[PDB]
Structures are given as C-alpha cells and as structure tokens.
Amino acid sequence: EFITPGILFLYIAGWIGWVGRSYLIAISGEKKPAMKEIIIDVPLASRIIFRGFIWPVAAYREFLNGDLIA
Amino acid sequence: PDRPIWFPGSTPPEWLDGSLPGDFGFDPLGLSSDPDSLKWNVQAEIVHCRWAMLGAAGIFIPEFLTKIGILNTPSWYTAGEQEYFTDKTTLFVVELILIGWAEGRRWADIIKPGSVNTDPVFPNNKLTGTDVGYPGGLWFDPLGWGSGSPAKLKELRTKEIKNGRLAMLAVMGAWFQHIYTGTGPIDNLFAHLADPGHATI
Amino acid sequence: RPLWFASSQSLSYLDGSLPGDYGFDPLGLSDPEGTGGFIEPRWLAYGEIINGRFAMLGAAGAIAPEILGKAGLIPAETALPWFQTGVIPPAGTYTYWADNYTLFVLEMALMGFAEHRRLQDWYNPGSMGKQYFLGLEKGLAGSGNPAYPGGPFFNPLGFGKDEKSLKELKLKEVKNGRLAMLAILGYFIQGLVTGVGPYQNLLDHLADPVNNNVLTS
Amino acid sequence: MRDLKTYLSVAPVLSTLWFGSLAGLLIEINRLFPDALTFPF
Amino acid sequence: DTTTWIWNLHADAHDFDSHTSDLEEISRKVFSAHFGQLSIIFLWLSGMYFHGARFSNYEAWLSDPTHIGPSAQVVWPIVGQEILNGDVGGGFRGIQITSGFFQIWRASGITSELQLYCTAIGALVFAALMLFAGWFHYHKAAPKLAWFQDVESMLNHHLAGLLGLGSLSWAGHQVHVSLPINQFLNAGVDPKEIPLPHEFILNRDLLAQLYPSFAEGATPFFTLNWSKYSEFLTFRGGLDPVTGGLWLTDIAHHHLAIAILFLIAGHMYRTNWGIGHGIKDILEAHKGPFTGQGHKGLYEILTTSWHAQLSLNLAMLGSLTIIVAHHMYSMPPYPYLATDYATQLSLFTHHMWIGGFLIVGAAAHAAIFMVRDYDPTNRYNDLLDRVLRHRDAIISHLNWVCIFLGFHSFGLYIHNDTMSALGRPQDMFSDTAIQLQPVFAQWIQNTHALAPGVTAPGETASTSLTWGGGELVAVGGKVALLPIPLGTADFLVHHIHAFTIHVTVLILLKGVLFARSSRLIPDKANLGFRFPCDGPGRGGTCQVSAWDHVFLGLFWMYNAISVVIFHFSWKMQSDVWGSISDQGVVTHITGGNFAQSSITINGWLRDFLWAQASQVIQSYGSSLSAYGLFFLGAHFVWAFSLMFLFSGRGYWQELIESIVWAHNKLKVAPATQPRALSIIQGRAVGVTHYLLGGIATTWAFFLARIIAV
Numbered sequence A: 001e002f003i004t005p006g007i008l009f010l011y012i013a014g015w016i017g018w019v020g021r022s023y024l025i026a027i028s029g030e031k032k033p034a035m036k037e038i039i040i041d042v043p044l045a046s047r048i049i050f051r052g053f054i055w056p057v058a059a060y061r062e063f064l065n066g067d068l069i070a
Numbered sequence B: 001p002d003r004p005i006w007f008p009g010s011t012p013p014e015w016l017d018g019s020l021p022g023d024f025g026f027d028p029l030g031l032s033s034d035p036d037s038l039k040w041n042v043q044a045e046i047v048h049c050r051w052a053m054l055g056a057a058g059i060f061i062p063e064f065l066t067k068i069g070i071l072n073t074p075s076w077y078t079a080g081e082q083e084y085f086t087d088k089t090t091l092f093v094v095e096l097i098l099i100g101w102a103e104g105r106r107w108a109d110i111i112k113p114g115s116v117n118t119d120p121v122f123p124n125n126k127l128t129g130t131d132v133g134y135p136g137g138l139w140f141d142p143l144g145w146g147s148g149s150p151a152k153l154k155e156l157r158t159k160e161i162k163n164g165r166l167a168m169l170a171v172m173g174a175w176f177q178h179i180y181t182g183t184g185p186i187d188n189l190f191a192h193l194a195d196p197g198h199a200t201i
Numbered sequence C: 001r002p003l004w005f006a007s008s009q010s011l012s013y014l015d016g017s018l019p020g021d022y023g024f025d026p027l028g029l030s031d032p033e034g035t036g037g038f039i040e041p042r043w044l045a046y047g048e049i050i051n052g053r054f055a056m057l058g059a060a061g062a063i064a065p066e067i068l069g070k071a072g073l074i075p076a077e078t079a080l081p082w083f084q085t086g087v088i089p090p091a092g093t094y095t096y097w098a099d100n101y102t103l104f105v106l107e108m109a110l111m112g113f114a115e116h117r118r119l120q121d122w123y124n125p126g127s128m129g130k131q132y133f134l135g136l137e138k139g140l141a142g143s144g145n146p147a148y149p150g151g152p153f154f155n156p157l158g159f160g161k162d163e164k165s166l167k168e169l170k171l172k173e174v175k176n177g178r179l180a181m182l183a184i185l186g187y188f189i190q191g192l193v194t195g196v197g198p199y200q201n202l203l204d205h206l207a208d209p210v211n212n213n214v215l216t217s
Numbered sequence D: 001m002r003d004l005k006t007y008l009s010v011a012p013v014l015s016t017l018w019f020g021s022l023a024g025l026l027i028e029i030n031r032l033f034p035d036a037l038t039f040p041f
Numbered sequence E: 001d002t003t004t005w006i007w008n009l010h011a012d013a014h015d016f017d018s019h020t021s022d023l024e025e026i027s028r029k030v031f032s033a034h035f036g037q038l039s040i041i042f043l044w045l046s047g048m049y050f051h052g053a054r055f056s057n058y059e060a061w062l063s064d065p066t067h068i069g070p071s072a073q074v075v076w077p078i079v080g081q082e083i084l085n086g087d088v089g090g091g092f093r094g095i096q097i098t099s100g101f102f103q104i105w106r107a108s109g110i111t112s113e114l115q116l117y118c119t120a121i122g123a124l125v126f127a128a129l130m131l132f133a134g135w136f137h138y139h140k141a142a143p144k145l146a147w148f149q150d151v152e153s154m155l156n157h158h159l160a161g162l163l164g165l166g167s168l169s170w171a172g173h174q175v176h177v178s179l180p181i182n183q184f185l186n187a188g189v190d191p192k193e194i195p196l197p198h199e200f201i202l203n204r205d206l207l208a209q210l211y212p213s214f215a216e217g218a219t220p221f222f223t224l225n226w227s228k229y230s231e232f233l234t235f236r237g238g239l240d241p242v243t244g245g246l247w248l249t250d251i252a253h254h255h256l257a258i259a260i261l262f263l264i265a266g267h268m269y270r271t272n273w274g275i276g277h278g279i280k281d282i283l284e285a286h287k288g289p290f291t292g293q294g295h296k297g298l299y300e301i302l303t304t305s306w307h308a309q310l311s312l313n314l315a316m317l318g319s320l321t322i323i324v325a326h327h328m329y330s331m332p333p334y335p336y337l338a339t340d341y342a343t344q345l346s347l348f349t350h351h352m353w354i355g356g357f358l359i360v361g362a363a364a365h366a367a368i369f370m371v372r373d374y375d376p377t378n379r380y381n382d383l384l385d386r387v388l389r390h391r392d393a394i395i396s397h398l399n400w401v402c403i404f405l406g407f408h409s410f411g412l413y414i415h416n417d418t419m420s421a422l423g424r425p426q427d428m429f430s431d432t433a434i435q436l437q438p439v440f441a442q443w444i445q446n447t448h449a450l451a452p453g454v455t456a457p458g459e460t461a462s463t464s465l466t467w468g469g470g471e472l473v474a475v476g477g478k479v480a481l482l483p484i485p486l487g488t489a490d491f492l493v494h495h496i497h498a499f500t501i502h503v504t505v506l507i508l509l510k511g512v513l514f515a516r517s518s519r520l521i522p523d524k525a526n527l528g529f530r531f532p533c534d535g536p537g538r539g540g541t542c543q544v545s546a547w548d549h550v551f552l553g554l555f556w557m558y559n560a561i562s563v564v565i566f567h568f569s570w571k572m573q574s575d576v577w578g579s580i581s582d583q584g585v586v587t588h589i590t591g592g593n594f595a596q597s598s599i600t601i602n603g604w605l606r607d608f609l610w611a612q613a614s615q616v617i618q619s620y621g622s623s624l625s626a627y628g629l630f631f632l633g634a635h636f637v638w639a640f641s642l643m644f645l646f647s648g649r650g651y652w653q654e655l656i657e658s659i660v661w662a663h664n665k666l667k668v669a670p671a672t673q674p675r676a677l678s679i680i681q682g683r684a685v686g687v688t689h690y691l692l693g694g695i696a697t698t699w700a701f702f703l704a705r706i707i708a709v
Ligand code: CLA
Pocket: B169, B170, B172, B173, B174, B176, B177, B180, B181, B188, B189, B191, B192, B199, B200, B201
C-alpha cells in the first residue's frame, strides 16, 4: 500500500535531483554559465542522464568524501 | 564550379563545391550547412544506396523468374508469413546481434577514423582503405578496383551513387504499387505495356 | 501618335517605347511608383504579349473544328463545339486513345519543361545556352529581350532584318493579340449564355438578323 | 540548419516535448494497468 | 543574468512602437499580424465545421429538433472519464453543445454531412492561403506608408465591396437555396427526400411550383413591376409559428435593402477622379454655432497614430457587440432557437463579456495615445485642449453623480431589507406598499405595441413580442416569447445598472484625462504610461499611472456585467420561459417569484443563489459532473488571486533570499538569479486570476443549471 511505492518514488526523485544537480556543476566553470540555462546543451545532458541510474551509490560515496556540501 | 546543376540557370549552394562524387548542387532546404552534418548525411546516403541495390535486385529478379515460369517463390509482400524452422523473433535476435557487431564497428570507424583497421585477434590482417565509408581491403575489395587515379575513383563513386538513388526510388515504387493495385510488380508492368493509354488511373 | 483616352498621369511614363502604346491607362496600374510583386511595367508588358499569343492560337483553334464540319471535310464525330471536346466532362466527352487524366499529366510534364526553361531565361539572361541539353543549347541563348528571343529555333524564316520592319510587325502582333483576347472573352460569354457553338451563333444571326440578337436572349 | 537545432533546444520547446512524452507514457501505463491501488508483486 | 528578463520577453512581444520609431515598419508588422489572426480564425472555423460532420448527431436532430439535444464532442475512455458521454438522444452519446451551430446550419439549408466536409476543407485551404499571404506581404512585397494613409480609398472599398457586396451575395444565397429547402423542411418532408440545392437552379419549374413568381424570370425586376416578387420578399413581421424564428423572406428582403444602401453609401469620398468629398475638407469646413473654429487638426492625428484609431474602433466594436447581444434574445433569427433555452442563455452572456473587455481596451489605448503620441506643438487640436483645460469640472461632477446614484439605488434595497426584518412589510418599496413604477418604459411598450396598423401600415405584426399587446407563441409545448411585464422590481435594477456604468466611466475617464499630468505629480508624462509609483513622498503615490486606472476599471467592469446577466437569467426564468399544457396554461420554471423576491438582498441570496445552485452541486456521478468539477476549481483560482493583490514585493524577495541560501548550501544555485515579480507584474497576475475564477464559476453555474431544467 505505502512502503513499496514509497521506495520507488524516492528512487525516481533522487534520480531527477541528482541529474539536475550534476548538470549545473558541469556548466558552472564556463565564462557565461547563465547562457546554458536557456539553450540546453543536449549532447552534454544526454551523457549525464545515464549517470543517474547509480545515484544512491554516487551520493553515498560523495557524502563520505566531503564533497556533498559547499 | 561549371558542373551541370539540378536546376540550370540557378545558383548552387556555397557548401557544395562539387568535390564530392555525385554532386549536383541539390539542397534547397539547406539540411547540410555544417561540415559534420555533411559528412553524416553522406555516410547515410551511401549506406542507403547500397542497401537499396541489395534489396531491389532481391525483389524484381525473383518475381521475374516466377512469372516467366522458372520458380514458384511467393510474393515479396507475403514472404514474412511463410513457414520456417524457428520462430521469427529468434531470427530477429540473431540478426540483431550480428548486424549490431557489424554496425558498431562501422560506427567506431566514422567517429575516429583508423581505429578499427586491424583484426582484433589476428593482427597480421588489416584493411587498406583510406576514406570513410569505403573500407577496401581483401575482405571487401578482392579485385583491386577500389584504388587508382582519383578521376577513376570519382567516376566509379558517382555511378554507384546514381544507381543507388535509382534503386531507392524503385523500391519505394514497388512498395506503393503493391499497396495500391494489390498485385505483383511484374504484373503491373505487363498490364501497363498491354495498354499504356488506359491501364493507369 | 494617336491617343486613346489618355490622361496626364498616364502620359508621364508611357513614353512610347513599348509596341502599340496608345496612352490608355485609366486605372494607372503600370505607374512606376510603388512597384512590387507582379505589378511591374516590364512584367505587365511580357504578360500582355504572352496572353495575346495564346489568345491568337485559341481563337482559331476553338472555331476550326466547327468550320470544317459543316463543309464535310471532317467526320461528324469530331465536329464538336469547343465546350464538348472533353474539356468539361459534364458538358460531354470524347474517347481518345487514353483517358483525360494521363493526357493532363503528359501536357503538364511537357509544358513544365518549356515554361520552366522560359522562366529561367526571364530571371537571368543568356543562361539557357550554357548547360548541355541534348546539344540544343546553341540556339536557345535568347537575344536579351524576354518577349522576343529570336534565334534559329524561333525565327527560322529570317523576318524583320531591319528595325523598322521589326517595329511594324511587333505593332501588328500586339493589335492581333488584343483582338484575339476580346474574341476569346466573347467566346466564353456566348457559350455561357446561348449554350451553342460560336459558329452556330453566327449562322443563326445571319439567317435572321432581326430576330437572333441579344435582345431576344 | 544549425539555427533549427538551436531553436529546438530552447527551454519551452524542449520542456513541451518532454512533458508530452511523459503524458503519453503515463497514459500508456494507466491503460495497461487500469484501476490500480496496491502492488500485487 | 536575472529572471526578470524572461518575464519582460513576453510582455513586449507585440509592442512594435517600442522596437522601432519608423511608421512604415510598424504598419507592415500590423498588416502581417492581421493576416496571421485571420488564418487562426479560419482554422478555428474549419475545426468547428469538421467536428459536426464526423462526431455529431446533426441528422437525427434535423429529423426531430425539439426532443433531441445537440452534440458535437465525444470523449475517449481512458481513466473512466467516459461517464461524460451522456444520453443526448438520437442513438448518440456525447457532450451537449450550446453554441447554436445546428440552428445556423439548418437555417442555411444544410441537410447532410457531405456539405460540412466540403466546407471544412475549404476553410482549411483558406487558412493556408492567408498564412502564405501574410508571409508574402511582409517579406517579399511590403507596401509603402503612402499606401496605408489613403483612408479615402479604404473607406470606399470597405463600405461598397466588403459590406455592400457581402450582403447582396448572402441575399442571393438565401433566395436561391435557403427559402425552398426550409419550406420543404417546414412542410414535414423527410430530410433525405428533399432535392439537392442545385436542382432548384437547374430545374426552374420546381421553383415555380413553390413560388409562381419565378416563372416570370428577371423581366419584372427590369420593368419596375416589383410587386410580383412579393411571394418571397415580404414585410410580415413577428415570429414563424412553425419554428419560432423570424420569417426567412423578411431576412432576404432586409439583406437586399442593406446591400443597396451600403453600395450607395460607398461612393462618398474623393479619389483620383475628383468626384466626392474629402475627409479633411469636411472636418475643416465644419463650424457650427458653439464649436467656433471647428475640428481642424484631427485628420493628421488620426492618420499618424495607430493607438487613437485602435481606441475608437474598440469602443465602437464593444458597443456593437452589446447591441447584438440585446437584439438576438428578443427577435430570434434562427429556427428552433427560442424554445432551446440552453443556447439562448449562453449567447447572451458571451457577447456581454466580450463587449465589456473591448470597451476597457478602448479606454486603455486612449490613455496610451495621450501619454505617447500627444504633441501640442506639431499636432495641435483645439477641442482636445479645451477638454484638457477644464478637466477639474468634468471629474468632480461625474464624481457627484456616482454618489447620488449609489445612494438612491442601494439604500432602497437596504431600507427594504430592514423593513422586512423589523416586521413592517407595509413600508417597503414594492408593488403593494410604495410603488415606483417605470412609467416611461411602459409608455414605450404601449406605443410600440400600437404602432402596427397606425404608424406602420405595411406591418402585419409588431417587431417583437416583448411589447405588451401581442399573443403567446408555443413551439413543441414550450414557451418561445410573450410580453414581459415591468414593475417596481425592474425600476431598481435599471438604476443599479446605471450606477455601475457611471462608476466605471468615472474611473476610466479620470485615468485618461490625468494621464499626462496632475496637481500631485506635474511631470507624470516623463515617467511613462506604465510605472508603479513615484515613491512614498507626498504621503504616498501608489498607483498614479493610467495603467493602474485601467487595472482598477477592470474590476468594476466585471462587477457591472455580472449583475446584468443575473438580472437576465432570473427575469427570463421567472417571467417568460416555461411550458404550456394542452389547455393553454403556462407554468414558468420558477413560478414568477421575481416580482416579490427581487426587492431585498436576502431574496437574491436565498431565492436565486441558494435555490438555483442545487443543480450544479448534485451533478456528481452523472454526465454533468464536469460542471460540478469546474464549479469548485474556479473558487480555488479566485481565492488564489488574493495572494498577489493583498501582498507586497519585499517579503517575497526576502523569502527567496533564504531559499537561495539553502540552495547555495548544496551547490544547486542557478546562474540565473531568482527575482520576485515586479510591482506592476504582481498586480497584473492578481486581476487575471480574479476574472478567470469569477467568470468560470458563473459559467459552470449557468450551464449546469439550464441544461438540467
Ligand atoms: C523507378 C520508378 C518507377 C517506375 C519505373 C514506375 C513504373 C510504373 N508505375 Mg509507379 N510508383 C513509383 C515509382 C515508379 N513507378 C513511386 C515512387 C510510387 C509511389 C508514389 C509509385 C506509385 C504507383 C502507383 C500507385 C501506380 C504505379 C503504376 C506504375 C505502372 C504504370 C505507370 C503509371 O501509372 O505510373 C505512375 C507513376 C507515378 C504516379 C509515380 C511518379 C514516377 C516516379 C516519381 C518516378 C519518376 C520517373 C522516373 C524518373 C523516370 C526515369 C526512370 C525510367 C527509366 C522508367 C508503371 C510500371 C500503376 C500500376 O500499377 O500500373 C497499372 C499504379 O497504379 N506506380
């Protein structure tokens, strides 16, 4: 009723959030990072999309290393 | 610069300088303004032309021999319904795997040329081709016709491309003829030749 | 030169370079101000000439089958009026060696070749004699004037060697074209009103002039 | 052309394509597994 | 850089005057935009015509108009939403439409679904043609400025050609197609046996059998023996007993006369040939007794500005739309429209809202012209200057009238309510205690009833049946039209209408007059047409611009229009609509309670809002449940609008600051800095949601109520 669909929603929402967070970090180093938020770099975005499959492991490892929080 | 154009008296586009084989300055929509788009579209056209020659000869030749009375093979339209030793999905999977290896090798060749020119397991054997899309080598060019003076290569590639365009048109025509009239392509030709004036719509 | 309903505005730009110019332009369509689209004096003159030539063909062509049919020169099966020869299927049809639509496609293909070549010559001059066209490109070069191409293909008899003769012949051509366009308009209106062939209309009028007029119809 | 790709990557058009594909997918599951309240797996 | 750029991008998309300062380019852009709008309208018409051919019960309705509900929409069965496919009759299931498209098609002579398909294809072709024409006339052949400023030729063509020839062509179509087919339909002939329209044109004895005058041909027209055409060109008046609409012969004669009049009127203004007047000469030479100098200088103003012309056209179109809404319920022009109550209520409410919106737009664009294009140095006009030189007297007098009307129209309701509450019913303003009779309207009604036979010898009946003295009309057991009584209850509501209209006029006119400058801010012209304020100085200068005056006037327009439609709905449900038994006894839907209950505010809350809303709130589980769902959704939008109207900008900017800190904490900070909405944008968002919620609530309430009963 609630437990099984809850974990699925958490996984999907974490996927979406991790993809969105990873896209912003990639373009932050550019000279005009604001231009990439309007005209989406599709070739760059397609590569990051597959990386959200392993978001739990990625976030678990990044939290331990200390790179999660600025 | 002075080569024949598709529309005589018109101005050809600036990105078609006639260097490529089979070039007639036909691109009104400008679908290949960028160099990468040009290369990708050229490869797509070459592959389509070769698959068309392969398929077109396999559709009209069997039907010609069937109608002339030599064989009894069924119509190409209904060839997917005949009996076979195994389910068609298994055949589809085997075909997918084999063509997947082949097309993956070809894809690796397009992006980074010269990266797949050596045999993975027998390093002695190589491929001698130099341009993308024309592998050459003993596997694909046994008779040595793929190398020579640039004029001969340009002429041969031009004639291959023109034959391919004709084959693609013919294959689409066969498909639509059989969807419309409901009979074999050869029967349509014989009906047209019997009475050219009236046997159309 | 004679003037026909000429006006001060129209006389300003219609100097007289065009053949058969009478100064007649009450609406001022060919005014050189605000020229755009297809409203351009050169294009208007070209269109008038081409329409005149086609009208001079059609005016004789529509009435030719009826002329000979009464004289017995042709079989009665082909002595049809201009609106019963398959152009309008509801009004009647004739069975040729092929149905009407394949004839339409063949006509469209051939005249598409011809008219596209003519248009390409109109846009840029002299470019129809450069690309190889079955070795016929030598004679299709044109003469710099879109409406009078000249050359061996279009002027085989060598008429108008002098400029004066050419001008007189051009004037006569444009007059005949205007008359033919009026005749074709009369053809259409008579066919729509009376319902018979134009030659039949002329014969009926000649038989009893006091009766077969517009007033009775 | 390049301008065709650049206009296609702008935020509104890309978002509309993504949401249309999403709605089609969601309707597909709702049609394939209708009237669902609990996971039977 | 920031997020306000995205909002600013869509705000100035169609402001061509800001992009360029050249009149030629603005004119060309306007021409192309008009072409695009025409293309969209044609596409909409094509969709409407196609849907009625494939997904409608038009034929079954045509075989039995009274007992079958029209329908043209069908729903897919995906998430259980197929419950909206009700049983509308005719062996069809779908959503019942209220746009009155079936009546138009029947009055045009359409009998089968093959003609609708052809019309849809033609409309699609026309839409493509219009789109191509727009592209061509902007990018290939763009006209010059001198072409647009030839207003003498534009008026001639738009009067003689667009309006003069359209009426004549429609009269021809009516005479040749609509009259015989409708005569056959009204005779009980089955629709599939009626001859095709072209048989009447091709075969003439068929037309001669129905109308003998068609045997004489066109000779009586040329011989001036026009009395022979009286068979299908009549001057009867009144409604058709069989169908309940106006006689089609009257419509044909009316369109012929209108076409001739417009064609005559289109030959007035001077052109290249030197016959006719010039507009500039008419304006200049006109000097009556009180104007003095005259209207010298308006030609340049109206030929060098697009906003003045837009304002004038918007005002005229809004007034015309309101007149159209009033003139269609009392003189139904289509067959089987009066007795179909759902469509009658929907057509009156649509055009009222459209007219109100267009009027407010006229006011806004007049203010824009005053702010931007006004030029006393190069474009001096005397009358505008004199109006601007005594604007204090105009506003102060208009302010007084509003107070007087409000007091003497609302205090009467409050006095009635108090007297009723105190148990003193003999002291109220009603038909039994203290009468305030609308004597002038009753005199007008009597005069119009008695006009036929005395002042209109050619008329056989009155123009409409609302004027008391006529006879009841019944079609299929329902009431179509009957005289409408006027009493004390109708005296108060008319003055309510007057009060609301006057207040709206006061707001809009004050904004327009004080757009340029005022005693508070002398340099208000330099600040612009659309600016929030001028700071907290002078005690506070919030909403001093003309844009804010239009923003305030929208609320009052919405308030004024809502009372009109409620008045119409209750008065028609209580006094006209109903049913008739076999013996001739009329039973109205609400039984005539408007006379006594509509004099106190409690009567509108209990007898109208409470009693008539039971249909929408009980629609759950039935085919009308979409109206019940839209009823609740619109309240949410209306209440959601209040967040933007009541609050300010600083609080939300600080909240967004905290949110941005929390985002920065996790390296998910966007490079486009979030910004709260501007002061002007926050106002525009609130009023949009307010109007949407109110209008949607009223729409759902009306549609759910009138379909059920
Ligand atoms: C190689 C191209 C080719 C050829 C030779 C033919 C030949 C033929 N088609 Mg056909 N066809 C084609 C392409 C072609 N088609 C394509 C691409 C389509 C899909 C649009 C069709 C759709 C089609 C239908 C629906 C029908 C035919 C029919 C026929 C036969 C009667 C002729 C006719 O009415 O055709 C009319 C052909 C067209 C309307 C298509 C236009 C022609 C294409 C574009 C090729 C252009 C001409 C080509 C450049 C000429 C050079 C090659 C030359 C050596 C032949 C005839 C044997 C009819 C049939 O069965 O006969 C009884 C029939 O009913 N065709």
